[PDB]
Amino acid sequence: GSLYLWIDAHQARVLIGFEEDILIVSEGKMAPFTHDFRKAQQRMPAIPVNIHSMNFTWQAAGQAEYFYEFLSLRSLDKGIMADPTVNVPLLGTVPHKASVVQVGFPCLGKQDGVAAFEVDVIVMNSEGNTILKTPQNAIFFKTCQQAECPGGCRNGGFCNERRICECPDGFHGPHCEKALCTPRCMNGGLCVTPGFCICPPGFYGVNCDKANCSTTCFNGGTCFYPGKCICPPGLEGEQCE
Amino acid sequence: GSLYLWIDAHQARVLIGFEEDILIVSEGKMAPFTHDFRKAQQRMPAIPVNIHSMNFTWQAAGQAEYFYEFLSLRSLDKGIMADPTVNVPLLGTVPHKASVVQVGFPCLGKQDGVAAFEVDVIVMNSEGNTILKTPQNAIFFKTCQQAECPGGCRNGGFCNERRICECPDGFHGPHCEKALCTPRCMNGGLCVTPGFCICPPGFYGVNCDKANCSTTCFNGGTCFYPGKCICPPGLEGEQCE
Amino acid sequence: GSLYLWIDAHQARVLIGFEEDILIVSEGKMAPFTHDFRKAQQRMPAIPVNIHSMNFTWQAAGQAEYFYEFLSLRSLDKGIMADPTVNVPLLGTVPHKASVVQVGFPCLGKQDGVAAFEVDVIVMNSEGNTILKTPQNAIFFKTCQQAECPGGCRNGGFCNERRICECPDGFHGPHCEKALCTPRCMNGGLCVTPGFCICPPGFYGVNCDKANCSTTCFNGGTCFYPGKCICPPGLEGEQCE
Numbered sequence: 001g002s003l004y005l006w007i008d009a010h011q012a013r014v015l016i017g018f019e020e021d022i023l024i025v026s027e028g029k030m031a032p033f034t035h036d037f038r039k040a041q042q043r044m045p046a047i048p049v050n051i052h053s054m055n056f057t058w059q060a061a062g063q064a065e066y067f068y069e070f071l072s073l074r075s076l077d078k079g080i081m082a083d084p085t086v087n088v089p090l091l092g093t094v095p096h097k098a099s100v101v102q103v104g105f106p107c108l109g110k111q112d113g114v115a116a117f118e119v120d121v122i123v124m125n126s127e128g129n130t131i132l133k134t135p136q137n138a139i140f141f142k143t144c145q146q147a148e149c150p151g152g153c154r155n156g157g158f159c160n161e162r163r164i165c166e167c168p169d170g171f172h173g174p175h176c177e178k179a180l181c182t183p184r185c186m187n188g189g190l191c192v193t194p195g196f197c198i199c200p201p202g203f204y205g206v207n208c209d210k211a212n213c214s215t216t217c218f219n220g221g222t223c224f225y226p227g228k229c230i231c232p233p234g235l236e237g238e239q240c241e
Numbered sequence: 242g243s244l245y246l247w248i249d250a251h252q253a254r255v256l257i258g259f260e261e262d263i264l265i266v267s268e269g270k271m272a273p274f275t276h277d278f279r280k281a282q283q284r285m286p287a288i289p290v291n292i293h294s295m296n297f298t299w300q301a302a303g304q305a306e307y308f309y310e311f312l313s314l315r316s317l318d319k320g321i322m323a324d325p326t327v328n329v330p331l332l333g334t335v336p337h338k339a340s341v342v343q344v345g346f347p348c349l350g351k352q353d354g355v356a357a358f359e360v361d362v363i364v365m366n367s368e369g370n371t372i373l374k375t376p377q378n379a380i381f382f383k384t385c386q387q388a389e390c391p392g393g394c395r396n397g398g399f400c401n402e403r404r405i406c407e408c409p410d411g412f413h414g415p416h417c418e419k420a421l422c423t424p425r426c427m428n429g430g431l432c433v434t435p436g437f438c439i440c441p442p443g444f445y446g447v448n449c450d451k452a453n454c455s456t457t458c459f460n461g462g463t464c465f466y467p468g469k470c471i472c473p474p475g476l477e478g479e480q481c482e
Numbered sequence: 483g484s485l486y487l488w489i490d491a492h493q494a495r496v497l498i499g500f501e502e503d504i505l506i507v508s509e510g511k512m513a514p515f516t517h518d519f520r521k522a523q524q525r526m527p528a529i530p531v532n533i534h535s536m537n538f539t540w541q542a543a544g545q546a547e548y549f550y551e552f553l554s555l556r557s558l559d560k561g562i563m564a565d566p567t568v569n570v571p572l573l574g575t576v577p578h579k580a581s582v583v584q585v586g587f588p589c590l591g592k593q594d595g596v597a598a599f600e601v602d603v604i605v606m607n608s609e610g611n612t613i614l615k616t617p618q619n620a621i622f623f624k625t626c627q628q629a630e631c632p633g634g635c636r637n638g639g640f641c642n643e644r645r646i647c648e649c650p651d652g653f654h655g656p657h658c659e660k661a662l663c664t665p666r667c668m669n670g671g672l673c674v675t676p677g678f679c680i681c682p683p684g685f686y687g688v689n690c691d692k693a694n695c696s697t698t699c700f701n702g703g704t705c706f707y708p709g710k711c712i713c714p715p716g717l718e719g720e721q722c723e
């Protein structure tokens with residue numbers, strides 16, 4: 001094994017208070033506290049009102065390729081909290097360089113109270129086998145407080161106690177209406193001052209949605225990178241044969 | 242070679258002032274200033290009163306496994322400074338992910354003056370051979386100033402100039418008596434708000450001391466991880482045969 | 483591929499404003515915005531007066547060795563801006579550990595206006611073949627404002643709006659005349675309080691210029707590390723035969 005998934009010391013100081021790396025996956029295996037995942041589910045409280053998003057660092061150190069897939073990112077209480085977001089594309093290859101994953105919990109602000117959610121993700125080997133996964137029906141909670149802003153915050157903005165909208169990347173102003181780029185960049189894209197979006201590897205366009213493949217995937221295969229492709233059971237190889 | 246041991250730029254700014262990575266081990270070999278280790282021992286002053294602990298970053302980049310062992314962490318002047326500590330278990334495998342090692346120098350506060358210490362550590366290959374090591378009888382110094390606190394600081398706490406105890410992880414209050422978890426977490430464990438300890442890989446329990454092994458080590462062999470085990474000279478393999 | 487060249491999130495916040503990793507090279511291939519390098523050259527403005535230097539992070543994750551060579555670092559407008567600098571030696575091996583490259587743009591302060599420059603660099607494989615390179619005649623710009631200091635700043639120091647010289651590493655005072663070490667450390671060396679320079683791997687001396695080689699390179703070969711050596715076309719191997 002070579003997979004490492006953890007929380008950085010800087011993020012750790014906001015959530016727990018202790019400035020240290022919180023290891024989740026080490027050498028391709030889950031941390032000792034994750035074995036009894038359910039006993040760990042109790043020892044985890046609802047995400048506080050102050051914590052809006054969470055930074056999860058990951059990397060495949062070895063020469064071995066590892067693929068990830070976010071199966072379900074559903075909010076069970078849609079009236080309070082909107083479906084949780086990721087600054088990474090749902091399906092893709094895990095980087096060999098230490099990279100941060102921004103897991104955003106969007107509270108609507110219209111209703112007060114604690115809202116539940118699902119975060120289902122699978123990690124697979126080059127052969128296409130699930131090694132590390134989210135144990136069946138994982139439910140995590142997030143506390144959302146009611147906050148009213150004059151006019152209302154647009155494009156995933158949350159109203160602060162000082163009645164000022166907290167605008168997200170590529171947006172600014174009082175209601176977050178003044179945008180730099182015309183379409184907002186997706187899959188982890190970035191808008192420069194002139195405009196447009198700096199597209200992540202595997203995507204191109206204006207919003208970074210169009211994806212090219214050097215090798216087309218056969219027999220109901222999903223392409224994510226022109227290097228490697230996921231194959232259904234019974235079919236093996238590059239083009240799934 | 243693939244071993245890299247260095248000091249991070251953020252730590253470097255506190256000790257030297259210059260914000261840059263201080264490389265010690267590069268590509269499995271010691272840095273040019275370490276060759277004449279003794280000439281480097283002069284150019285190193287006593288650890289200042291303000292610097293309480295030091296952060297040492299390390300990682301095995303290649304597919305090759307590397308094992309470390311802290312042989313001796315003794316304080317030669319026990320009346321001034323207590324034996325230096327490490328937030329890592331004495332024996333173990335060096336991570337493939339960039340990880341920080343907190344080397345704490347505990348000044349008792351009862352006596353004023355400079356105290357000497359020993360930091361002996363060995364780095365070994367998969368075969369079990371010492372490649373990188375601390376050259377024979379390494380003596381480093383730490384300046385400790387006398388500071389008196391009303392009542393006295395407990396559980397490795399040092400009294401500040403403002404007469405307030407500097408409580409360590411898992412402890413708080415005026416004398417550091419108010420603890421979250423009942424036993425303090427060891428080997429790099431972390432206590433959550435409810436309690437208990439988030440155990441590091443290779444340990445389990447309440448204080449993270451109990452260690453399990455999938456393969457038992459024969460002929461006087463010490464187990465640290467169920468994957469690999471250290472074997473004495475003459476015996477080679479997984480179970481030491 | 484295994485090469486990764488990017489800009490760190492902390493540096494990104496100063497230049498663009500968005501705190502996120504700006505990927506340039508991913509898995510040995512250039513980022514989607516770099517393909518039409520010229521269209522990317524327009525979307526890049528002149529380096530602002532406030533930004534004096536830029537931090538570029540890089541690393542070769544795989545067991546594969548990668549060599550870099552800074553071919554040209556020329557300032558086309560020598561009257562305004564002096565030739566751009568790098569805290570890394572021109573020719574060398576790319577680290578397997580995440581390391582920062584300080585690209586300094588030295589404005590002379592004598593003249594006001596925007597100055598152009600060239601940054602040519604090549605990345606090669608173990609066989610000695612250029613894989614990733616700077617596309618032909620790359621011209622980037624830097625805005626330099628006129629600032630006068632009483633006496634004048636020495637050893638690459640730039641005068642601030644408060645008329646105080648911004649002294650570089652190993653220098654301090656009003657005109658940056660008071661130096662710690664007598665010769666200034668080169669190739670990424672560091673001067674301690676007593677003096678001298680902590681030499682980077684592959685260099686030794688007082689200024690870190692003298693380089694040793696365990697294997698001498700034949701038929702017009704340039705040595706950088708005693709492990710690997712660059713060979714001209716027609717000759718292949720360790721000693722270039």
Ligand SMILES: O=S(=O)(O)OC[C@H]1O[C@@](COS(=O)(=O)O)(O[C@H]2O[C@H](COS(=O)(=O)O)[C@@H](OS(=O)(=O)O)[C@H](OS(=O)(=O)O)[C@H]2OS(=O)(=O)O)[C@@H](OS(=O)(=O)O)[C@@H]1OS(=O)(=O)O
Binds near residue numbers: 172173178499
């Ligand atoms: O002096 S000011 O109070 O007016 O602030 C001037 C600086 O505002 C910037 C960036 O401020 S920063 O975000 O805190 O660094 O421009 C940004 O803010 C202005 C509005 O100023 S205000 O104080 O926030 O209202 C925005 O103009 S507008 O959208 O309100 O009309 C800028 O949007 S735009 O770039 O002009 O499209 C906004 O830029 S950004 O969206 O935040 O990127 C700086 O201008 S900047 O450096 O071009 O970004 C100003 O610094 S400056 O030295 O005066 O230019």
Ligand SMILES: O=S(=O)(O)OC[C@H]1O[C@@](COS(=O)(=O)O)(O[C@H]2O[C@H](COS(=O)(=O)O)[C@@H](OS(=O)(=O)O)[C@H](OS(=O)(=O)O)[C@H]2OS(=O)(=O)O)[C@@H](OS(=O)(=O)O)[C@@H]1OS(=O)(=O)O
Binds near residue numbers: 017413414419
């Ligand atoms: O408003 S206060 O001055 O009273 O400070 C309130 C916040 O104190 C916290 C954390 O403060 S922090 O460490 O600086 O962020 O609780 C922590 O401090 C209190 C005592 O407050 S005091 O000002 O430091 O004396 C401790 O209570 S006690 O130990 O003194 O009785 C907390 O211990 S305990 O969690 O209550 O067991 C101590 O928590 S911790 O040991 O530092 O983890 C915040 O409470 S917290 O967020 O639950 O940690 C308070 O913020 S809050 O919004 O008012 O709750």
Ligand SMILES: O=S(=O)(O)OC[C@H]1O[C@@](COS(=O)(=O)O)(O[C@H]2O[C@H](COS(=O)(=O)O)[C@@H](OS(=O)(=O)O)[C@H](OS(=O)(=O)O)[C@H]2OS(=O)(=O)O)[C@@H](OS(=O)(=O)O)[C@@H]1OS(=O)(=O)O
Binds near residue numbers: 655
């Ligand atoms: O109390 S003071 O205002 O005098 O500042 C005292 C501290 O100055 C240091 C470091 O200051 S720091 O850089 O901000 O941390 O020494 C450094 O500054 C002094 C001059 O003080 S002044 O206020 O900047 O003028 C320099 O002396 S001199 O060069 O002007 O004669 C030091 O150079 S030298 O080390 O004495 O050669 C300069 O050190 S450095 O070049 O910046 O490394 C601290 O001394 S230090 O800790 O040895 O570096 C002083 O803190 S202390 O607790 O008073 O010693």
Ligand SMILES: CCCCCCCCCCCCCCCC(=O)OC[C@H](COP(=O)([O-])OCC[N+](C)(C)C)OC(=O)CCCCCCCCCCCCCCC
Binds near residue numbers: 046056120121140434
């Ligand atoms: C990368 C995408 C997948 C992963 C994406 C799916 C998961 C997405 C949701 C994860 C976030 C929800 C977990 C809990 C977050 C949290 O806030 O932790 C609870 C406490 C918080 O601390 P507190 O009780 O609020 O107190 C703070 C103030 N004091 C008193 C401490 C000073 O903090 C703690 O004590 C423990 C925090 C450390 C544990 C966090 C990790 C838990 C999530 C495990 C997910 C891994 C499983 C999936 C991967 C196989």
Ligand SMILES: CCCCCCCCCCCCCCCC(=O)OC[C@H](COP(=O)([O-])OCC[N+](C)(C)C)OC(=O)CCCCCCCCCCCCCCC
Binds near residue numbers: 284289
């Ligand atoms: C990871 C466990 C092992 C390793 C654990 C064993 C070692 C544990 C003790 C290490 C710490 C003791 C070394 C020195 C620490 C120190 O404070 O450095 C002295 C100077 C400090 O600077 P100063 O003289 O106080 O001045 C500061 C203010 N100015 C004026 C600069 C602005 O700073 C410097 O100029 C040089 C600092 C950089 C050198 C630090 C590394 C030295 C330790 C080498 C250990 C490696 C060998 C063992 C591994 C093979």
Ligand SMILES: CCCCCCCCCCCCCCCC(=O)OC[C@H](COP(=O)([O-])OCC[N+](C)(C)C)OC(=O)CCCCCCCCCCCCCCC
Binds near residue numbers: 525528530601603615
């Ligand atoms: C490592 C040595 C080689 C590499 C060394 C050779 C290159 C050396 C020069 C590189 C630096 C020059 C590039 C541009 C630097 C820069 O300032 O970016 C322009 C804008 C700046 O933003 P701004 O327009 O000033 O606005 C800031 C305030 N706002 C309004 C945003 C809130 O920022 C941006 O919008 C885009 C910034 C991100 C792009 C930077 C990378 C461009 C350089 C590519 C070089 C790679 C090619 C060579 C390697 C194959």
Ligand SMILES: *[C@@H]1O[C@H](CO)[C@@H](O)[C@H](O)[C@H]1NC(C)=O
Binds near residue numbers: 009019252295296341
């Ligand atoms: C650096 O050391 C400080 C204590 O001096 C510690 O709080 C901090 O978390 C350490 N940095 C890292 C990355 O662990």
Ligand SMILES: *[C@@H]1O[C@H](CO)[C@@H](O)[C@H](O)[C@H]1NC(C)=O
Binds near residue numbers: 213511514
């Ligand atoms: C596909 O896109 C990648 C960048 O993501 C590019 O390097 C490659 O050349 C493209 N292939 C084709 C056929 O366009």
Ligand SMILES: *[C@@H]1O[C@H](CO)[C@@H](O)[C@H](O)[C@H]1NC(C)=O
Binds near residue numbers: 250260535536
């Ligand atoms: C980033 O650049 C600044 C100078 O602008 C430098 O002081 C800092 O140390 C650099 N960051 C790193 C990690 O080197």
Ligand SMILES: *[C@@H]1O[C@H](CO)[C@@H](O)[C@H](O)[C@H]1NC(C)=O
Binds near residue numbers: 029032443454455467
């Ligand atoms: C030993 O502990 C590890 C976690 O450190 C666990 O994954 C493994 O299954 C355990 N083996 C046995 C036999 O309990």
Ligand SMILES: *[C@@H]1O[C@H](CO)[C@@H](O)[C@H](O)[C@H]1NC(C)=O
Binds near residue numbers: 011053054055491501
């Ligand atoms: C950590 O999360 C914050 C938002 O809460 C984000 O701004 C920051 O850039 C993240 N850190 C990294 C390295 O991405």
Ligand SMILES: *[C@@H]1O[C@H](CO)[C@@H](O)[C@H](O)[C@H]1NC(C)=O
Binds near residue numbers: 694695
């Ligand atoms: C060459 O220098 C390296 C350090 O850069 C050193 O380890 C090696 O032993 C030296 N070889 C000779 C012959 O001096």
Ligand SMILES: *[C@@H]1O[C@@H](C)[C@@H](O)[C@@H](O)[C@@H]1O
Binds near residue numbers: 221231
């Ligand atoms: C991607 O995964 C493959 C297996 C098929 O289910 C496709 O329909 C899907 O888009």
Ligand SMILES: *[C@@H]1O[C@@H](C)[C@@H](O)[C@@H](O)[C@@H]1O
Binds near residue numbers: 461463472473
């Ligand atoms: C671990 O190392 C082995 C070689 C033996 O010395 C054991 O007794 C020790 O605990």
Ligand SMILES: *[C@@H]1O[C@@H](C)[C@@H](O)[C@@H](O)[C@@H]1O
Binds near residue numbers: 712714
């Ligand atoms: C290093 O590169 C080799 C190929 C020759 O051009 C030498 O002269 C140079 O210094």
